[PDB]
PDB file of all heavy atoms in Angstrom:
ATOM      1  N   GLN D  38      -1.117  13.833  14.415  1.00  0.00           N
ATOM      2  CA  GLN D  38      -0.225  13.577  15.532  1.00  0.00           C
ATOM      3  C   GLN D  38       0.687  14.773  15.755  1.00  0.00           C
ATOM      4  O   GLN D  38       1.555  15.066  14.932  1.00  0.00           O
ATOM      5  CB  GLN D  38       0.613  12.322  15.280  1.00  0.00           C
ATOM      6  CG  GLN D  38       1.287  11.771  16.521  1.00  0.00           C
ATOM      7  CD  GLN D  38       2.301  10.691  16.210  1.00  0.00           C
ATOM      8  OE1 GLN D  38       2.252   9.595  16.770  1.00  0.00           O
ATOM      9  NE2 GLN D  38       3.233  10.991  15.311  1.00  0.00           N
ATOM     10  N   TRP D  46      -7.626  10.786  15.953  1.00  0.00           N
ATOM     11  CA  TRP D  46      -8.469  10.555  14.787  1.00  0.00           C
ATOM     12  C   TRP D  46      -9.235  11.822  14.414  1.00  0.00           C
ATOM     13  O   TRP D  46      -9.874  12.441  15.267  1.00  0.00           O
ATOM     14  CB  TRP D  46      -9.439   9.405  15.061  1.00  0.00           C
ATOM     15  CG  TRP D  46     -10.374   9.114  13.934  1.00  0.00           C
ATOM     16  CD1 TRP D  46     -10.193   8.206  12.932  1.00  0.00           C
ATOM     17  CD2 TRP D  46     -11.648   9.724  13.696  1.00  0.00           C
ATOM     18  NE1 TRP D  46     -11.271   8.221  12.081  1.00  0.00           N
ATOM     19  CE2 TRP D  46     -12.179   9.144  12.527  1.00  0.00           C
ATOM     20  CE3 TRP D  46     -12.388  10.710  14.354  1.00  0.00           C
ATOM     21  CZ2 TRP D  46     -13.417   9.512  12.006  1.00  0.00           C
ATOM     22  CZ3 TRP D  46     -13.617  11.075  13.836  1.00  0.00           C
ATOM     23  CH2 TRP D  46     -14.118  10.476  12.674  1.00  0.00           C
ATOM     24  N   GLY D 128     -13.977   0.460  11.818  1.00  0.00           N
ATOM     25  CA  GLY D 128     -13.019   1.119  10.943  1.00  0.00           C
ATOM     26  C   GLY D 128     -11.629   1.054  11.545  1.00  0.00           C
ATOM     27  O   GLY D 128     -11.339   1.739  12.528  1.00  0.00           O
ATOM     28  N   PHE D 130      -7.272   0.920  10.745  1.00  0.00           N
ATOM     29  CA  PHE D 130      -6.354   1.561   9.810  1.00  0.00           C
ATOM     30  C   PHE D 130      -5.237   0.627   9.354  1.00  0.00           C
ATOM     31  O   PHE D 130      -4.249   0.426  10.061  1.00  0.00           O
ATOM     32  CB  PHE D 130      -5.776   2.820  10.462  1.00  0.00           C
ATOM     33  CG  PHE D 130      -6.774   3.573  11.300  1.00  0.00           C
ATOM     34  CD1 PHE D 130      -6.889   3.320  12.657  1.00  0.00           C
ATOM     35  CD2 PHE D 130      -7.616   4.514  10.727  1.00  0.00           C
ATOM     36  CE1 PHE D 130      -7.812   3.999  13.431  1.00  0.00           C
ATOM     37  CE2 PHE D 130      -8.539   5.195  11.495  1.00  0.00           C
ATOM     38  CZ  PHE D 130      -8.637   4.940  12.849  1.00  0.00           C
ATOM     39  N   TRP D 133      -0.690   3.171   6.129  1.00  0.00           N
ATOM     40  CA  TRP D 133      -0.457   4.556   6.536  1.00  0.00           C
ATOM     41  C   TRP D 133       0.506   5.256   5.583  1.00  0.00           C
ATOM     42  O   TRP D 133       1.388   4.623   5.002  1.00  0.00           O
ATOM     43  CB  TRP D 133       0.114   4.609   7.956  1.00  0.00           C
ATOM     44  CG  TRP D 133      -0.813   4.105   9.015  1.00  0.00           C
ATOM     45  CD1 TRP D 133      -1.248   2.821   9.184  1.00  0.00           C
ATOM     46  CD2 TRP D 133      -1.405   4.872  10.067  1.00  0.00           C
ATOM     47  NE1 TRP D 133      -2.081   2.745  10.277  1.00  0.00           N
ATOM     48  CE2 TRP D 133      -2.194   3.990  10.833  1.00  0.00           C
ATOM     49  CE3 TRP D 133      -1.348   6.218  10.432  1.00  0.00           C
ATOM     50  CZ2 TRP D 133      -2.918   4.416  11.944  1.00  0.00           C
ATOM     51  CZ3 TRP D 133      -2.063   6.636  11.533  1.00  0.00           C
ATOM     52  CH2 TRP D 133      -2.841   5.741  12.275  1.00  0.00           C
ATOM     53  N   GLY D 134       0.328   6.566   5.426  1.00  0.00           N
ATOM     54  CA  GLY D 134       1.232   7.374   4.633  1.00  0.00           C
ATOM     55  C   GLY D 134       2.334   7.971   5.487  1.00  0.00           C
ATOM     56  O   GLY D 134       2.392   7.727   6.691  1.00  0.00           O
ATOM     57  N   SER D 202       1.707  25.805  22.339  1.00  0.00           N
ATOM     58  CA  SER D 202       0.634  25.902  21.357  1.00  0.00           C
ATOM     59  C   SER D 202       0.707  27.224  20.601  1.00  0.00           C
ATOM     60  O   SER D 202       0.355  27.295  19.425  1.00  0.00           O
ATOM     61  CB  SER D 202      -0.729  25.764  22.039  1.00  0.00           C
ATOM     62  OG  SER D 202      -0.895  26.744  23.050  1.00  0.00           O
ATOM     63  N   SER D 209      14.576  26.345  30.083  1.00  0.00           N
ATOM     64  CA  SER D 209      15.106  26.751  31.370  1.00  0.00           C
ATOM     65  C   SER D 209      16.434  26.061  31.639  1.00  0.00           C
ATOM     66  O   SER D 209      16.590  24.867  31.385  1.00  0.00           O
ATOM     67  CB  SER D 209      14.108  26.439  32.485  1.00  0.00           C
ATOM     68  OG  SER D 209      13.781  25.061  32.504  1.00  0.00           O
TER      69      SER D 209
ATOM     70  N   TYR U  37      -1.411  -0.749  17.262  1.00  0.00           N
ATOM     71  CA  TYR U  37      -0.557  -0.160  16.242  1.00  0.00           C
ATOM     72  C   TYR U  37       0.841   0.118  16.788  1.00  0.00           C
ATOM     73  O   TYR U  37       0.997   0.496  17.946  1.00  0.00           O
ATOM     74  CB  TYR U  37      -1.173   1.131  15.706  1.00  0.00           C
ATOM     75  CG  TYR U  37      -2.540   0.930  15.101  1.00  0.00           C
ATOM     76  CD1 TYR U  37      -3.684   1.038  15.877  1.00  0.00           C
ATOM     77  CD2 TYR U  37      -2.687   0.624  13.756  1.00  0.00           C
ATOM     78  CE1 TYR U  37      -4.935   0.853  15.330  1.00  0.00           C
ATOM     79  CE2 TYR U  37      -3.934   0.438  13.199  1.00  0.00           C
ATOM     80  CZ  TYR U  37      -5.055   0.551  13.991  1.00  0.00           C
ATOM     81  OH  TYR U  37      -6.301   0.363  13.439  1.00  0.00           O
ATOM     82  N   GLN U  39       4.202   2.361  16.289  1.00  0.00           N
ATOM     83  CA  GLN U  39       4.884   3.507  15.694  1.00  0.00           C
ATOM     84  C   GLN U  39       6.346   3.535  16.122  1.00  0.00           C
ATOM     85  O   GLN U  39       6.665   3.799  17.278  1.00  0.00           O
ATOM     86  CB  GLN U  39       4.206   4.821  16.077  1.00  0.00           C
ATOM     87  CG  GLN U  39       4.737   6.011  15.286  1.00  0.00           C
ATOM     88  CD  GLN U  39       4.056   7.313  15.644  1.00  0.00           C
ATOM     89  OE1 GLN U  39       3.681   8.096  14.768  1.00  0.00           O
ATOM     90  NE2 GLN U  39       3.899   7.565  16.941  1.00  0.00           N
ATOM     91  N   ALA U  44       5.994   6.238  10.220  1.00  0.00           N
ATOM     92  CA  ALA U  44       4.552   6.211  10.422  1.00  0.00           C
ATOM     93  C   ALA U  44       4.113   4.923  11.125  1.00  0.00           C
ATOM     94  O   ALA U  44       4.842   3.934  11.117  1.00  0.00           O
ATOM     95  CB  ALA U  44       3.835   6.353   9.090  1.00  0.00           C
ATOM     96  N   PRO U  45       2.917   4.938  11.737  1.00  0.00           N
ATOM     97  CA  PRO U  45       2.404   3.737  12.404  1.00  0.00           C
ATOM     98  C   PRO U  45       2.115   2.588  11.442  1.00  0.00           C
ATOM     99  O   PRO U  45       1.783   2.821  10.279  1.00  0.00           O
ATOM    100  CB  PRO U  45       1.099   4.221  13.056  1.00  0.00           C
ATOM    101  CG  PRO U  45       1.206   5.699  13.112  1.00  0.00           C
ATOM    102  CD  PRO U  45       2.022   6.093  11.927  1.00  0.00           C
ATOM    103  N   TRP U  92     -12.629   2.106  17.339  1.00  0.00           N
ATOM    104  CA  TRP U  92     -13.465   2.886  16.429  1.00  0.00           C
ATOM    105  C   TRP U  92     -14.918   2.410  16.459  1.00  0.00           C
ATOM    106  O   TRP U  92     -15.399   1.770  15.524  1.00  0.00           O
ATOM    107  CB  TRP U  92     -12.901   2.811  15.009  1.00  0.00           C
ATOM    108  CG  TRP U  92     -13.289   3.970  14.131  1.00  0.00           C
ATOM    109  CD1 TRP U  92     -12.732   5.216  14.128  1.00  0.00           C
ATOM    110  CD2 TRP U  92     -14.302   3.982  13.121  1.00  0.00           C
ATOM    111  NE1 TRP U  92     -13.342   6.004  13.183  1.00  0.00           N
ATOM    112  CE2 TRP U  92     -14.312   5.268  12.547  1.00  0.00           C
ATOM    113  CE3 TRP U  92     -15.212   3.031  12.644  1.00  0.00           C
ATOM    114  CZ2 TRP U  92     -15.188   5.633  11.528  1.00  0.00           C
ATOM    115  CZ3 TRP U  92     -16.081   3.386  11.629  1.00  0.00           C
ATOM    116  CH2 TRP U  92     -16.063   4.677  11.084  1.00  0.00           C
ATOM    117  N   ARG U 100     -14.302   6.333  19.616  1.00  0.00           N
ATOM    118  CA  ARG U 100     -13.344   7.092  18.787  1.00  0.00           C
ATOM    119  C   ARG U 100     -12.144   7.738  19.488  1.00  0.00           C
ATOM    120  O   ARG U 100     -12.120   8.950  19.696  1.00  0.00           O
ATOM    121  CB  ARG U 100     -14.081   8.190  18.014  1.00  0.00           C
ATOM    122  CG  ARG U 100     -14.975   7.682  16.904  1.00  0.00           C
ATOM    123  CD  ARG U 100     -15.343   8.812  15.961  1.00  0.00           C
ATOM    124  NE  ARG U 100     -16.515   8.484  15.158  1.00  0.00           N
ATOM    125  CZ  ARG U 100     -17.338   9.380  14.622  1.00  0.00           C
ATOM    126  NH1 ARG U 100     -17.131  10.676  14.798  1.00  0.00           N
ATOM    127  NH2 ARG U 100     -18.378   8.972  13.906  1.00  0.00           N
ATOM    128  N   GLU U 165       2.208  22.225  29.460  1.00  0.00           N
ATOM    129  CA  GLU U 165       3.094  21.992  28.325  1.00  0.00           C
ATOM    130  C   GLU U 165       4.243  21.091  28.760  1.00  0.00           C
ATOM    131  O   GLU U 165       5.067  21.487  29.584  1.00  0.00           O
ATOM    132  CB  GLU U 165       3.638  23.311  27.771  1.00  0.00           C
ATOM    133  CG  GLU U 165       2.577  24.279  27.268  1.00  0.00           C
ATOM    134  CD  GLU U 165       2.106  23.962  25.860  1.00  0.00           C
ATOM    135  OE1 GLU U 165       2.325  22.823  25.394  1.00  0.00           O
ATOM    136  OE2 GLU U 165       1.519  24.857  25.214  1.00  0.00           O
ATOM    137  N   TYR U 182       5.791  22.494  32.015  1.00  0.00           N
ATOM    138  CA  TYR U 182       5.445  23.860  32.394  1.00  0.00           C
ATOM    139  C   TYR U 182       3.944  23.996  32.608  1.00  0.00           C
ATOM    140  O   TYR U 182       3.149  23.529  31.791  1.00  0.00           O
ATOM    141  CB  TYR U 182       5.910  24.845  31.318  1.00  0.00           C
ATOM    142  CG  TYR U 182       7.395  24.805  31.042  1.00  0.00           C
ATOM    143  CD1 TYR U 182       7.954  23.774  30.293  1.00  0.00           C
ATOM    144  CD2 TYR U 182       8.239  25.790  31.533  1.00  0.00           C
ATOM    145  CE1 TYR U 182       9.310  23.733  30.043  1.00  0.00           C
ATOM    146  CE2 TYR U 182       9.598  25.757  31.283  1.00  0.00           C
ATOM    147  CZ  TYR U 182      10.128  24.726  30.540  1.00  0.00           C
ATOM    148  OH  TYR U 182      11.479  24.686  30.288  1.00  0.00           O
TER     149      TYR U 182
END
Side-chain angles (χ1 to χ4, degrees):
Chain D
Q38 196 190 233
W46 178 93
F130 322 93
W133 296 67
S202 57
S209 57
Chain U
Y37 301 90
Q39 190 179 225
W92 204 79
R100 290 196 199 155
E165 299 278 18
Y182 302 76

